[PDB]
Structures are given as structure tokens and as C-alpha cells.
Amino acid sequence: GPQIPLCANLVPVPITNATLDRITGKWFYIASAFRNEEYNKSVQEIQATFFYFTPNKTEDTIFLREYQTRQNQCFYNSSYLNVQRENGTVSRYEGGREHVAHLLFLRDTKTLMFGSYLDDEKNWGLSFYADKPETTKEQLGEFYEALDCLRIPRSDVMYTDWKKDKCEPLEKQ
Ligand SMILES: CN[C@@H]1C[C@H]2O[C@@](C)([C@@H]1OC)n1c3ccccc3c3c4c(c5c6ccccc6n2c5c31)C(=O)N[C@@H]4O
């Protein structure tokens, strides 16, 4: 039977053209937690990350430009996401493998989450993003609410530190 636990702030919803408009623009990676060992190992080294979404509605794709600071250096990538409208997921090929994430929303309109491996209690997790590099306490509290649905302790959360970003001064020029 169905395996994804639904709770107040963890609700998959179909991606529409209104959804694609809402996620168009620049986003900042704020925090995440997973039961999946590989994702935990990767994201624990991330100091900062921001990225740009540019949807192509007719082709069911999103153009992605990523600016990630780790090891005190700026690293860049561009690629295309595939959009699964009815499933409410996006997918990409990265690191020689496919990734799929549920696009998830909270009550505050300027944040969003990616749900990873949500049908797998051994591996599930959430990553949290906002339209500014730092969120308010109440904004972050919604992410903690969603994490409670996956029964992951807040002590497992990894956070970016915007003071450590190296990409912003380099993105243009
Ligand atoms: C490939 N990225 C991985 C799979 C999934 O979630 C993670 C958490 C994973 O990164 C470990 N993840 C991040 C973690 C830390 C900072 C940024 C990201 C990020 C972005 C994206 C995606 C993504 C798009 C489609 C399917 C799965 C996805 N995942 C991510 C991202 C993205 O599109 N932009 C972000 O930089």
C-alpha cells in the first residue's frame, strides 16, 4: 500500500503552470536532513548554495543554474530538470545517476522543500530553500514541522551559513 506519510506541512501536490511560475527565479539552500547516508555525506560539506529556476512549460523542463560553496570555493553547474506534472516531482541526472524529488510547499509563500525518497522509511528526507539566503524563525519552524512527519530529529539537520558563501561576488562579471 501507499508509503508516503502525509501530515500538515508534508503534502505532495501536482505541478501546474501556476507552480512553475511560483518557483521561477533565485532560491537559496537553507537546511536539510535525510535518513539516506549518501545524501547526508554530500550535503554535510555544503557551506552555501543558491540557484536559478527557468521553467519551459511546453517542454516540461526547468533550466537550472547552481552556485555552490564548499571547501571555501565557488562551484557552478547548469542542467535541465524534467518535470512530472501529475506526480508533482522533478528529476535530474547528476553524478551518474537519476534523482527524483517531490516539490513541496509550506504556509509561507517564499519557501519550498524537496522531498527525497519519500516512499522509503530507510532513506527519506527533506531539503529546505527560500527566496533569501536566511529565513525567519517562523519560516524555519515550518520545515521543522515537516521533518516531524518523517520522524527525523532536529539534531540531524545540517545548515548553510551565508557568511561563508563565495559565489555571489563571482556570479556576474
Ligand atoms: C542532486 N541533488 C540532490 C538530489 C535532490 O536533493 C538534494 C538534497 C541532493 O543534493 C544532495 N539537493 C540539494 C542539496 C543541497 C543543496 C542543493 C540541492 C539541490 C538542488 C536541486 C535538486 C533537485 C532537482 C531535481 C531532483 C532532485 C533534486 N535534488 C536537488 C538538490 C535543484 O534543482 N537545485 C538545487 O541546487
Author numbering: -1 to 171
Article passage:
The α1-acid glycoprotein (AGP) is an abundant blood plasma protein with important immunomodulatory functions coupled to endogenous and exogenous ligand-binding properties. Its affinity for many drug-like structures, however, means AGP can have a significant effect on the pharmokinetics and pharmacodynamics of numerous small molecule therapeutics. Human plasma lipocalins present as two variants known as AGP1 and AGP2 (or F1/F2/S and A forms, respectively).
Cocrystallization of UCN-01 with AGP2 yielded crystals diffracting to 1.82 Å representing the highest resolution achieved for an AGP2 complex to date. Glu64 and Arg90 sit above the plane of UCN-01 and form a salt-bridge connecting β-strands C and E. This carboxylate – guanidinium group interaction lies perpendicular to the UCN-01 aromatic system allowing the formation of a hydrogen bond from the lactam ring 7R-OH to Glu64 and a cation-π interaction with Arg90. Tyr37 appears to form a parallel VdW interaction with one face of the oxy-bridged seven membered ring of UCN-01. The structure reveals that the hydroxyl group of UCN-01 is important and is oriented toward Glu64, forming a hydrogen bond and indirectly assisting with orienting Arg90. However, the reversal of the stereochemistry at C7 not only breaks this hydrogen bonding, but is likely to invoke a clash with Phe49 and a further shift from the optimal binding pose. The addition of UCN-01 to AGP2 resulted in a significant increase in the melting temperature shifting by 13.7 °C from 61.9 °C to 75.6 °C, again indicative of high affinity binding of UCN-01 and thermal stabilization of the truncated form.
